[PDB]
């Protein structure tokens, strides 16, 4: 009836037994913080303990180092720094020695390394860590777990610490990340850890994306990963393409034409909602980037000089293959649920609106054919899609250029307000609402 014992009771179904174990652990953090942490790290560090215990130990440690409330988190980070340097040097030592000794997933240690580091790195307090983390991944003998859990830690560190505090280590890290991502890596799990790590390290690899030698390698590595048979790795890989596109638009010429287009397009068509979700996000991101450019460009028009960066109108160039997919995606309607849920359908529509405000006028002639063919369809889905799509293109094409179209639509737009389907009725309403509003 020790600590391992109290920890395991933190998952016991018995309500009384839980609040019990919980109270114990709370005072322990209050009246015995330094010791408590060294003990928990000792539990976590021992591969002889239950997954139940280790994970619990890890959760307690991580809980005394961070919170989602910036204020609380600040308070915890300070409390930790105020702890004896030798106690901390021991917790750090154990937490670290854990990496590569866990059989369960994810790693419960990486969450602790990321916890302590977020408090200690911004103060040059654990200057050894990164070198250690990088060596763990790049050692030619490192186990399949050594790389995976280390990459998860590197990943969490990048995710929660100011990227401003890693640019001076950006090359070391990136090497370790790209290392667990290259196809030669046997494990997709390591490949998965590596890919989510990269996703949070883009913020400070700007110096690396600038060197064409390296940007071509990163991009190839990411691309080969959108082809991974493990859906998770794919989605993670597509997630990078989406962020790379908003953080490095100016360098996408080389790949966009011969690679991205194909990948993202197919992704949008995937049967797997999470993958389709990424494809869409990617082209919404493009419209966004391209819209701010149209501004930055127009602003330089007044100042009679050229803008810093120029748009390449990738969005307008894909209008041909995007529109049909987006409209088709609006067919994947949610009969039953959450008008709060983010499914491909919700995505597509928001995307379309973006595509509209982007390829302003040239959006209508591509959307109409779908609206026409379906506005009067037996399937409530297609009937709603048509009414939906019409509601999306409303804001983009010239206010004047639209009015005539609104002329011929208005009739049917009203009928639908009396359509059986509550969904269609709701949609029709929204659409008609936008009309009366915008174009007086």
């Amino acid at each position: 009836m020790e600590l391992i014992t109290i920890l395991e009771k933190t998952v016991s179904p018995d309500r009384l037994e839980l609040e019990a174990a919980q109270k114990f652990l709370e005072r322990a953090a209050v009246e015995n913080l330094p010791t408590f942490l060294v003990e928990l790290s000792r539990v976590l560090a021992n591969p002889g303990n239950s997954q139940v215990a280790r994970v619990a130990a890890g959760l307690q440690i991580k809980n005394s180092l961070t919170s989602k409330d910036p204020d609380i988190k600040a308070q915890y980070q300070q409390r930790w720094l105020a702890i004896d340097a030798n106690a901390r040097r021991e917790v750090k030592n154990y937490v670290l020695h854990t990496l590569g000794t866990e059989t369960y997933r994810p790693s419960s240690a990486s969450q602790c390394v990321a916890g302590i580091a977020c408090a200690e790195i911004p103060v040059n307090q654990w200057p050894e860590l990164i070198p250690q983390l990088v060596a763990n991944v790049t050692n030619p003998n490192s186990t399949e777990h050594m790389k995976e859990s280390t990459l998860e830690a590197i990943g969490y560190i990048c995710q929660d610490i100011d990227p401003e505090q890693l640019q001076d280590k950006s090359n070391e890290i990136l090497t370790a990340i790209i290392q667990g991502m290259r196809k030669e890596e046997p494990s997709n799990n390591v490949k998965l850890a590596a890919t989510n790590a990269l996703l949070n390290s883009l913020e400070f690899t700007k110096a690396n994306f600038d060197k064409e030698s390296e940007r071509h390698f990163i991009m190839q590595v990411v691309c080969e990963a959108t082809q991974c048979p493990d859906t998770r790795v794919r989605v993670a890989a597509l997630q990078n393409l989406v962020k790379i596109m908003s953080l490095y638009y100016q360098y996408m010429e080389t790949y966009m034409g011969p690679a991205l287009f194909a990948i993202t397009i197919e992704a949008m068509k995937s049967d797997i909602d999470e993958v389709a979700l990424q494809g869409i996000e990617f082209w919404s991101n493009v419209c966004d980037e391209e819209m701010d450019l149209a501004i930055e460009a127009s602003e330089a028009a007044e100042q009679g000089r050229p803008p810093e960066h120029t748009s390449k109108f990738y969005a307008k160039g894909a209008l041909q293959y995007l529109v049909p997919i987006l409209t088709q995606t609006l067919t994947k309607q949610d009969e039953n649920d959450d008008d709060d849920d983010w499914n491909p359908c919700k995505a597509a529509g928001v995307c379309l609106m973006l595509l509209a405000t982007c390829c302003e006028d040239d959006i209508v002639p591509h959307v109409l054919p779908f609206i026409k063919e379906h506005i009067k369809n037996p399937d409530w889905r297609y009937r709603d899609a048509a009414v939906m799509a019409f509601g999306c293109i409303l804001e983009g094409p010239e206010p004047s250029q639209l009015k005539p179209l609104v002329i011929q639509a208005m009739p049917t737009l009203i009928e639908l307000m009396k359509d059986p389907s509550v969904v269609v009725r709701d949609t029709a309403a929204w659409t008609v609402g936008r009309i009366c509003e915008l174009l007086p």
């Binding site: 330094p34 010791t35 060294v38 004896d84 030798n86 106690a87 040097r89 021991e90």
Partner: peptide, 4 residues
């Protein structure tokens, strides 16, 4: 360490 933690102690002494």
């Amino acid at each position: 360490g933690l102690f002494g």
